[PDB]
Structure 1
């Protein structure tokens, strides 16, 4: 059966990537939360 995760690096980066996060204030708040928590990987970009 076709499962839900059908990987595409382009879609991944555009939907969740660093620049996508930076584009909106809510996205920048995601980065702020993740830095505050001290995540080693802020976004999928890596």
Structure 2
């Protein structure tokens, strides 16, 4: 059965990666929040 997650690296990056996040204000905010939290992996970026 075709399950929901069907990985594709480029797609992932474009969607969720650092640059995408940077591009918008909300993305930036998210990043900031993550930083505040103390996340080790700030984004999906490898």
TM range (shorter): over 0.9
CA RMSD in angstroms comes to 0.3
* Unaligned segments of structure 2, at least 5 residues: none
Q: Aligned partners of 1:43, 1:4: CA distance in 2, in Å?
A: 21
Count matched residues. 46
Find runs of 4+ consecutive structure 1 residues off by over 2 angstroms: none
* Unaligned segments of structure 1, at least 5 residues: none
List per-residue Cα deviations over 1:6-46 (Å, max 9, x = no partner). Answer: 00000000000000000000000000000000000000001
